[PDB]
């Protein structure tokens, strides 16, 4: 989780309050990273991630 | 001595001439029982009409609005209006008779 | 049209069994168009899905039979099936009688009707089972007082 939050901060300048991780049945890890209330995850996904 | 006031409002069916307020008053006078026996109103329970299709009850005993609703439903079953009229408690001691929800077919 | 998913969702929303879920048979199409719990709650608010009331189970005959057994009915030999000790244990009866007698003795000792030594003798006699119940203990106390007054 610390490596994930460090990678997010280094790549997209994203700060998080908490991260939950689970290993999927297909074998890959999935992370739910909750952002700080100051920044908008919809805005981040629209601009940096292109998730519209 | 404490007193309790009950209102049975049949204004809309009385205006529709489906519900007979005088017949309901006679039914209440004949069917309200005090100490387990009917025809024992005396000075305990007063039944009157305050007009506009309403029945008003003074009770010095522990008469229940649930019992009054039960007798109202008994009268509606006798008059074959049980399947079409509902007695809804709208206030403290006020039971109002109104039509069920009707769908236009 | 298949409505197993809608019935399961309606049961989970209403907090009841799936046998208590009523789906309107004239609105099957827009019930099937509901694929989410929000839509299920919307149909519940619209009245297309209702929760059926509980199936009838009354206690009236049980209460009437209990009142009959209170007034004494159905207690005959043809009604009895267990042994006398199974129906009412002699140990329980002895426990109740001993507790009642000891409570009455300590009450009389507190009230001062009986003194300490006569209380001790009554306690030993009660443990030795000469007192069948309270009025037996009371008449024993009264005759003891009468003998003491006659001696004095």
């Amino acid at each position: 989780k610390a490596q994930i939050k460090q990678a997010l901060k280094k790549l997209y300048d994203i700060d998080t309050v908490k991260i939950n991780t689970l290993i999927r049945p297909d074998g890959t890890k999935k992370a739910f990273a909750r952002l700080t209330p100051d920044v908008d995850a919809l805005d981040i996904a629209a601009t940096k991630l292109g998730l519209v | 001595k404490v007193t309790k006031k009950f209102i049975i409002n049949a204004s809309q069916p009385a205006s529709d001439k489906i519900f007979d307020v005088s017949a309901f008053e006679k039914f209440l006078n004949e069917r309200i029982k005090v100490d387990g026996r009917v025809g024992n109103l005396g000075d305990v329970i007063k039944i009157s009409q305050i007009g506009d299709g309403k029945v008003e009850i003074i009770a010095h005993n522990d008469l229940s609005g649930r019992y009054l609703k039960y007798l109202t439903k008994k009268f509606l079953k006798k008059m074959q209006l049980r399947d079409w009229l509902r007695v809804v408690a709208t206030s403290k001691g006020v039971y109002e008779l109104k039509f069920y929800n009707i769908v236009n077919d | 049209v298949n409505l197993r998913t809608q019935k399961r969702l309606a049961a989970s929303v209403l907090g009841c069994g799936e046998g208590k879920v009523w789906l309107d048979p004239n609105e099957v199409s827009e019930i099937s168009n509901a694929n989410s719990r929000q839509s299920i709650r919307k149909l519940v608010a619209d009245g297309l899905i209702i929760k059926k009331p509980v199936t009838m189970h009354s206690r009236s005959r049980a209460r009437e039979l209990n009142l009959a057994r209170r007034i004494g009915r159905h207690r005959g030999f043809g009604k009895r099936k267990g042994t006398a000790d199974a129906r009412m244990p002699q140990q329980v009866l002895w426990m109740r009688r001993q507790r009642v007698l000891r409570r009455l003795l300590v009450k009389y000792r507190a009230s001062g009707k009986i003194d300490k030594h006569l209380y001790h003798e009554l306690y030993h006699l009660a443990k030795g089972n000469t007192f069948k119940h309270k009025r037996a203990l009371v008449e024993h106390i009264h005759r003891a007082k009468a003998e003491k007054a006659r001696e004095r």
């Binding site: 290993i23 999927r24 049945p25 297909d26 074998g27 | - | -």
Partner: protein
């Protein structure tokens, strides 16, 4: 069971990813001899042997 180790879950992950029919573009290749998945696995039929 629900209580499983990382190695066992990783082997199950590989088995679940391998449990698939062959793609339809495989059959259209020239000189293709594969017609189905001869190593296809089902939970009821054959055990994994872990």
């Amino acid at each position: 069971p629900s209580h499983k180790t990382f190695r066992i879950k990783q082997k199950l992950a590989k088995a679940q990813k391998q449990n698939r029919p062959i793609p339809q573009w495989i059959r259209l290749r020239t000189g293709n001899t594969i017609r189905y998945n001869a190593k296809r696995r089902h939970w009821r039929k054959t055990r994994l042997g872990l």
